[PDB]
Each structure stands twice: as structure tokens, then as C-alpha cells.
Paper text:
Collectively, these data demonstrate that RcpC forms the Tad pilus alignment complex, which provides a conduit across the periplasm for the Tad pilus filament to access the extracellular milieu.
Using this map, we were able to build an atomic model of RcpC33-303 containing twelve copies of RcpC. From this model, we determined that the RcpC dodecamer has a diameter of ~15 nm, and possesses a ~5 nm pore at its centre. Accordingly, RcpC adopts two distinct conformations in this structure, which differ in the relative position between D1 and D2, explaining why the overall symmetry of the complex is C6. Although present within the sample, there is no density for the C-terminal β-hairpin domain, which we could not resolve in spite of extensive 3D classification and masking strategies. The overall structure of RcpC demonstrates that individual subunits are twisted around the central pore with the D1 domain of each subunit primarily forming contacts with the D2 domain of the neighboring RcpC subunit. Additionally, L3 forms molecular contacts with the D2 domain of the adjacent RcpC molecule. These interactions lead to a very extensive interface between RcpC subunits, measuring ~2400 Å2 within dimers and ~1930 Å2 between dimers, which collectively are comprised of four distinct interfaces.
Author numbering:
A (entry chain B): 54 to 246, 258 to 268
B (entry chain C), C (entry chain A): 56 to 188, 202 to 246, 258 to 268
Amino acid sequence: ERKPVLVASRDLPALAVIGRDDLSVELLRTAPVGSYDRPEALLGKRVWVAVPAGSILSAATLEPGGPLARTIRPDERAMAIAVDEVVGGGGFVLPGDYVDVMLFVRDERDGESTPLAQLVLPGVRVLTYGERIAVGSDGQDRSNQEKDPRPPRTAVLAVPEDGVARLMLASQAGSLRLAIRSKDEELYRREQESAALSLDQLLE
Amino acid sequence: KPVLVASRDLPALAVIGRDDLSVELLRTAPVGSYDRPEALLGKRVWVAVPAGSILSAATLEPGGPLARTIRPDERAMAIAVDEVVGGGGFVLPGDYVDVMLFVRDERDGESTPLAQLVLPGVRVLTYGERIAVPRPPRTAVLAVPEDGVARLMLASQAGSLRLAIRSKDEELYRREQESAALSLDQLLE
Amino acid sequence: KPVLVASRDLPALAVIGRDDLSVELLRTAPVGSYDRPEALLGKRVWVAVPAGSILSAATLEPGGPLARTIRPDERAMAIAVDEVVGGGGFVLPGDYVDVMLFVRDERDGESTPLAQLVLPGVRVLTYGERIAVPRPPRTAVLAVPEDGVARLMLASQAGSLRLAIRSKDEELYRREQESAALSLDQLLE
């Protein structure tokens, strides 16, 4: 009726080895899939991600992976770009948003310089903005809560495999900016189931 | 000590009733846990929650505020602002502005100043640290039509931008909720 | 006072029993000496110890931690990282990464920026001050295949490097336990 489930009695850091002092036993009505019944099954194993106090010990916590790798899919990658207030919508971008990446470059191919602007990546989910991170299928938030809030300097995006190179070029060949997309498009729900413009065309 | 637990499997994008939740007494309560059942009644889970799991961080809406103030045919983008650029520090969110550009052409080996209007009637979504649904402002976020994002990027990076404020008596919010380039030759002579 | 000495000639790479040891009481005990016989039972001497010698520092493993985390067909190399390179400080040891390179290649008298994937699926052994055998991180150690070592070195010095994290659902750790470059012309078209 009331099954035993093992939980953490203290704040286990990342890359820690479990002893008998860290574990505790509790009696519940339902045992989650992935839980353990006796302390001897978990002794000597390594937790590969931080476990807050009181958390139910799970099998997936004892496998190689990081906070970023637990919030993506096998057909995506996670890469970071340098951001400021102008690039990131005045500091109003939070994880879960969908953005378009715009590039400004000054080509120097045929002995002459030409400013240009293009759209490189449409509809990209934002995983981290600053010290805040998204929530994966595990239902756990792993945002670094620290005092003295410094302005954000980096953001991590979920990029398809074919575009990881295209972003990298755009990050170093010129300047980047982010354009936010509307919430009424429901790109989040749907995922749970261009010609370059020159100054000659702009100036009449 | 009290902690909420999922009694059955809750699928993605599902509302919460009293049958779904249970209360269990644990020695330590994790960060993010909820005590009374009424605190999670009517809310929606955004990831799948297997049975018996402690409920936390799955009831938080993914997204930001800027995405809640535009329409599917618009985008939100930010530009750099100073006191000269935006209305002497008298521009507030909820206004309508025209974007003007000054650039030096640099074609055919002769430089030529120019001035031109790039985007008319754009709605201001944020002025510095001010949003609607003692430090000088540094940026402003506007709601651009989907065909004008590249134009604004090119204008912002190629030259200098200024904002011209439009009148309140034009009723540009009701209509929402239903040329050429001047050169120094034309000005001087 | 009590000090442990050897009773017979102990050859290299030999385990220690109760017959090989003796206890002698000396006025001064040198640094590195062991007081009780059970402190050295089961340990191994890594250099030859002649008879009557005071036992110290011959019972210490020669080696470091990194060499215990790789296989005969792999090597360990360090690369320089910042927050942009290493995913905003959310990369831990045990993760798998792809290495991407940006270089400005010059063979014709004209410079052409390029981007390319150098190494796919590389385990991360150490992130700064973190190992599985404050101050911002500066280096990260990777387990490279033996044929790719040189390929990393060039990429580390000829241009800029970035890391792309792979998903946990791919299950590359269980697997371990048993293209063309893109130029600015392709992007701007």
C-alpha cells in the first residue's frame, strides 16, 4: 500500500558520491518510475547533476549529462551567442521565447564595400538568458540564483543541426540582433506535438 | 512538511483538478513545492508529469512579456536611444513615432549626405525600464511590421536614427484595433 | 619513536605482507615514515627497496588523475574557454560536445571567412576546477581520439573555437561502453 522511496537529506553538489548520510527513506502512496527502494542500490554511485534537498532520487540523475543537455532533443544543439541590451530586446527576453536572428555585415568581395542585412535563423527557442534556464521534461529548474545581479552577457539557443555552422559565421562576420515573435502563434504548443537588402534598395 | 504530489499521470497542457493532486507529509520540503491544494487549482502544467512526482517548476509559463504585446504579423525589436534621438526624454510607451535616417552614401567615390523616412507610425512598446503589459534610458523597443525588420537593422547600423512623435488626435490606436531622399543639393540651392 | 623498516630485499612492483616489514624504535622519526604495520599492508612499492631501509615515498603511486579517465586509443588535451565558448557556464563534466571553428583563410591574396565542424561527440573530462575521476573558469580538458589531436591544435590556434552541446537522449555514453565548409557567399544569397 504505502511504498518506500529514497530521497536526499541534504544538498548534494554536482559530481558527488553518495554515502549513507546523504540518503533518507520516506513512505508514500505512489512510487515514481525510476525511484529506488533500498539504500544499498545507491551507495557508491555518482550524481552527475546537483540534487536539491528533499528531491526524490531518480535513475536519470545517475547518468552522464548536464543542465543544458537535459532540455533539448536529439535533432538539436545548444550554442551560445554574445548579447547586450540592444541585441536582447532591452533585457526583456526570457527562456521559452521564440526569436528571429538578423545579421548585419559589410561585404568586401569585389574591391568595394557594401552594407547588408539578412535573416539567417527563423523561429528559434531561447534556452538561457543570463543566469536563467528553461525547464525540461524532468520538471526541475536549475537557474543559478545569486546575489549582486550583474547585467546579462550571454544567451543560449536551441539550433537545428543544419544551422549550427550558419550561426557561427553570423556571430563573427558581423553584428547580430534578435526579433521576438508573438505568443499567439503558439509555436510552443506546435513543437510539443531571405533575400538580402542593400543600401541602394533602401535609399530610393 | 506538507507537499503536493501528482496522483495520476498528467499529460502536457492539462488543467488541474482536485482529483489530480494529493498531499504527503515529508521531513524536508524542496524549493518550489506548494503546501495547500488550492494554490495549484486551475493552473496548467506545461510538461508531462509522471505519477507520484513532487509538483514544482512544471506549473511555470514559458515566455516573456514582450511576446504578449504584439500580433502574429509583427515583431519586437530594440534600437539605441539618447535624449536627442527620442523626444527629449518625453517619449512614453503607447506612442507612435516615425523613424528618420541620416547616412552618407559613399558610392562612385564621392560622399553625399542624405535624409529619408524609413518607417512611419511605429508603436513604442518599451522606453528604458518602462513597459505596459535615476539612470538615463539606453534602448527602446518598437513593434515593427514583419517586412520592415531588415530595413530597420540596416538603417540602425548604417547611419544615424531619429524619432518624430505623431499627434494623439490622429487616432492611430483605433485604426490598429479596427517620398524620395533629400540631399544637400536640394536644401542649399 | 616507532618507525617501519624493510626486512628483506623487496623487488619492484611487489605487494607488502607482514613478513617483509619490521619495527624499530628511533629517536627521530623522518618525515614520510609510517608508525604501524597495518598502514602499509596491501600497498605496493614502485621502486626497489633494499634491506634495512626506512620505508617512505616508495609506496606512492606515480601518476595523475587525468590518465585514469581515458582509454589507450584516446588522449587528453586542454582548450581555452570563456562563457561564450562553453555554453554560458552550464557545461559540466560528462557532457558530449561538438567543436566548431571560425577561420579567416588567406590563400590567393583575398581573405574568406569560413566555418566548419572539426570534432563531433567529444567527452568533457574537466571544466575549470571540476573533475570526475569563486573564480571564472579558464580551461576545459577534452578526451580526443588519437587521430584528431593535431586537428584540434591547428583549430585552436588558426582561429576561434566554439562548443555545441548534444542531447542526453542520444545515449552516447552507452555507445562508448559498446562536411563542406560554409562561406559568406552561401549565407548571403
